[PDB]
Amino acid sequence: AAHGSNPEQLKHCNGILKELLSKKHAAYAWPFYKPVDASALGLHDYHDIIKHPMDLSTVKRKMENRDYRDAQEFAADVRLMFSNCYKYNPPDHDVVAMARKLQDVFEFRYAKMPD
Amino acid sequence: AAHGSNPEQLKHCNGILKELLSKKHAAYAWPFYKPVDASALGLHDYHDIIKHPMDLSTVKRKMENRDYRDAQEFAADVRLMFSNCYKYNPPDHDVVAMARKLQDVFEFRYAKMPD
Numbered sequence: 001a002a003h004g005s006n007p008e009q010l011k012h013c014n015g016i017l018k019e020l021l022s023k024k025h026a027a028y029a030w031p032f033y034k035p036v037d038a039s040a041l042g043l044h045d046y047h048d049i050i051k052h053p054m055d056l057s058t059v060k061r062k063m064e065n066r067d068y069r070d071a072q073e074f075a076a077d078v079r080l081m082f083s084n085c086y087k088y089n090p091p092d093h094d095v096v097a098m099a100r101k102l103q104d105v106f107e108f109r110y111a112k113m114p115d
Numbered sequence: 116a117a118h119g120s121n122p123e124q125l126k127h128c129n130g131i132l133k134e135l136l137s138k139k140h141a142a143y144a145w146p147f148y149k150p151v152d153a154s155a156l157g158l159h160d161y162h163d164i165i166k167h168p169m170d171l172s173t174v175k176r177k178m179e180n181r182d183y184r185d186a187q188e189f190a191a192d193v194r195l196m197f198s199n200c201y202k203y204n205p206p207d208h209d210v211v212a213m214a215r216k217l218q219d220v221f222e223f224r225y226a227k228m229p230d
């Protein structure tokens with residue numbers, strides 16, 4: 001159901017995406033810039049636990065390829081990225097605190113979606 | 116695409132839903148128990164700002180009526196509820212702090228989804 005709102009809402013999503021990637025948030029966004037390299041980090045159970053990896057460079061490639069048909073699809077991916085982090089890591093890990101901070105940035109601006 | 120996982124994942128979702136409704140979290144979940152009554156609260160702009168209201172009693176009715184076909188649909192509704200709160204209220208409002216606490220409960224247990 002391609003709504004006329006979809007392109008305008010996808011622009012807002014792209015703006016959020018640019019912000020998450022910006023230096024404003026780099027101190028806590030950086031773990032999510034690129035796909036988790038499980039072997040390089042010694043996390044040999046990561047791909048058994050996480051069945052759908054996601055990261056901001058993948059979200060960016062999808063946006064640039066016009067893969068997302070609506071804001072909801074884009075939001076599901078960004079939230080999947082954070083969920084994977086909450087699934088794999090103990091709740092008191094530093095990367096979890098970073099994920100919650102970035103997700104806070106994401107959720108509050110996603111909530112400002114034009115409609 | 117009804118996967119064989121969908122009913123088992125929908126059980127996990129129903130467990131999350133029961134937990135969000137439980138007395139364990141009542142001190143911060145209560146604003147989300149029932150649909151926002153905008154007139155009763157004097158929020159005469161609420162339904163201009165919020166185009167898709169959502170609350171836990173609606174999520175519960177949908178679950179009981181077998182409206183959700185998958186965990187993703189259920190998660191989109193719960194997150195919509197929180198997003199509506201972040202959209203309408205100033206970020207330093209008490210209800211926003213409550214929403215973030217409840218959403219924390221939701222996201223960390225949603226991340227434990229069987230798969």
Ligand SMILES: O=c1nc(Nc2cccc(Cl)c2)oc2cc(Cl)oc(=O)c12
Pocket residue numbers: 030031032036041043084085088089095
């Ligand atoms: O989201 C994650 N991002 C990262 N980034 C990362 C961390 C250290 C070095 C480099 Cl090059 C990248 O690593 C993770 C490790 C674990 Cl255990 O879980 C995760 O969810 C993530």
Ligand SMILES: O=c1nc(Nc2cccc(Cl)c2)oc2cc(Cl)oc(=O)c12
Pocket residue numbers: 145146147151156158199200203204210
């Ligand atoms: O989610 C919300 N839940 C509530 N509950 C609520 C608040 C006071 C009394 C009663 Cl009976 C219910 O009120 C809200 C007011 C505003 Cl401004 O925004 C909101 O998002 C919400």
